[PDB]
Amino acid sequence: AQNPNCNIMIFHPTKEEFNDFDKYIAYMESQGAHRAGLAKIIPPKEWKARETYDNISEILIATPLQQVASGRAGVFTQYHKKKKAMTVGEYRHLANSKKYQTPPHQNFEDLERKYWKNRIYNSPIYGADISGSLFDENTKQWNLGHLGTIQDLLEKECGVVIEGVNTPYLYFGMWKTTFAWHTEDMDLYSINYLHLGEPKTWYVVPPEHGQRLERLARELFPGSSRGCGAFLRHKVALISPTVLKENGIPFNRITQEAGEFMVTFPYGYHAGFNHGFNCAEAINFATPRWIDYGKMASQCSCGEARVTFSMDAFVRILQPERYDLWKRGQD
Ligand SMILES: Cc1ccc(C(N)=O)cn1
Ligand SMILES: O=C(O)CNC(=O)C(=O)O
Ligand code: NI
Ligand SMILES: [Zn+2]
C-alpha cells in the first residue's frame, strides 16, 4: 500500500501534467496521497491564476464574520458575529491595523506557537464564503471556476440527472482567522488555491482515522455532542495539535503559501488558521471514488448545519433513508 503512514504529500506537476485535472487527482491517489486527507500541489512555473491582483479592492465582503472564541486555549468553540459590510480594500486595511496585524515572529513554528497560545483572547474578522472567482477566464488549467460539476459526476456515475450547481467561494483572511475541524459537505473533496498574501496553516486527520477525532470531540465538547450526533458539521470546534497529541489522535500539519493548491480528500478532517491578510478560493468537487463516501456520510439533522441547495439532491439520491429526517432539519 502506498503512503501507509498517511503523510501529507507534495506534488510538482509539469505543465503537461497540469492539463487534465481529473487525471492528476487520480495520479496523486495512485501514490497514496488521499491517505493523509490533504495534499499540496505546486503549479508549474509557467502557470498563473491571473495577471495581477492590483484591482481587487472593490470586491464587497457583504457580511464579515467576527470569530469569537469560548473555552480554553487548546479546546474551544467559536461563533460568528455578523459585522457591517466592507470592501476588500477596507478589510485589508483593517487586517494590517495594530489591533489585528500579525505579531513579530521568528518563523512559521513561532507563529504557530503564538496562535495556539493566544487565539482565544482575540476575535479576528473573516470574509468567508463569498461566491465568486479570481481566476482569469483565459486560465485553462486548474481554474476552480471551470471544473466538472458534482452534479455531472453523480450523473455520469449513477445515471441520474439532478438539479443543482456548484461554484467557487472566496475567503479573505487575517491573522488568527480560523477554520474549525470539519470534513466537507457529504464528505466531498475540496480544492483550495491561495491567491495572495500571507500563509495558511492546515491540520488534517487521515480519513481512515476520522472516527478517532470524532470520539475525542464528543469527549471534549460533551454538551454539543448531546445536542447533535454529528456536531462537527456545525464547523465551530477547535482542538490544538498539543491536545490531539496528548490523546493519541493521528494527524499532520502543513503550511500553504501564496500560489499553492491544497486538496482535501473525502472524509479528511481539517482545521487551520491564517497568518495575516490573504485571499483564498475554494470549491468542492467529486470523483468516482467519492461516491462511496457520499453514500456513507453522516449528517447533521439538528438544524444547526444549514447547507447549500445543492446538497438536497445528494442526500435524496445517495441517502434516501436519511432524506426525510435531514430535510426536516433544513427547515
Ligand atoms: C461528533 C461527530 C461530528 C460529525 C460526524 C460526521 N461523521 O459527520 C460524526 N461525529
Ligand atoms: O480556507 C478556509 O478558511 C477553509 N477552507 C477549507 O476548509 C477548504 O478549502 O476545504
Ligand atoms: Ni474544508
Ligand atoms: Zn447538528
Return the number of other C-beta atoms located less than 10 Å from residue 9's C-beta.
Answer: 19
Ligand showing the shortest atom-to-Cα distance for residue 303: 4
Which helix (DSSP H) or strand (DSSP E) does residue 178 occupy? Answer: strand 178-182
What would the grid cell of residue 219 be?
469527549
DSSP letters spanning 203-217: EEE-GGGHHHHHHHH
Contact 239, 206 (CB under 8 A): no
Question: 7 to each of 46, 230, 299, how far by Cα in Å?
Answer: 28, 26, 28
Angle, in degrees to the nearest 10, between helices 311-318 and 320-330: 150
Check if the beta carbon of residue 271 is closer than 8 Å to that of residue 184: no
d(CA 36, CA 15): 25
* Helix (H/G/I), strand (E/B), else coil: 104: coil
> For 290, how many CA atoms within 13 A lie in the half-sphere containing its CB?
29
**Residue 214 C-alpha to ligand 1 middle, in angstroms?**
6
Calpha distance 208→103 (Å, rounded)? 37
**What does the CA dihedral 212, 116, 64, 254 come to, rounded to 10 degrees?**
-60
Atom of ligand 1 nearest to the CA of 224: 1
CB 25, CB 31: distance < 8 Å: no
Tell me the CA distances in angstroms from 302 to 101, 231, 299, one per residue in order: 37, 9, 9
Residue 230 per-residue DSSP state: T
Place of cell 477566464: 137
Is the Cβ–Cβ distance between 269 and 160 less than 8 Å? no
User: What is the structure's resolution, reported in angstroms to one decimal?
Assistant: 1.3
3-state SS, residue 208 = helix
The conformation of residue 267, written as its DSSP 8-state character, comes to T
The verdict on whether residue 279 carries a ligand-binding annotation is: no
For the domain bounded by 1-331, which CATH number is listed? 2.60.120.650
Contact status, residue 276 vs residue 102, Cβ threshold 8 Å: yes
Is 228 annotated to bind ligand? yes
3-state percent helix, strand, coil for the chain, nearest multiple of 5: 30, 25, 45
Spacing, Cα 87 to ligand 4 middle (Å)? 32
| Residue matched to cell numbers 491517489 | 29
- Return the C-alpha cell found at 207: 480519513
Domain boundaries, the chain: 1-331
**Technique used:** X-ray
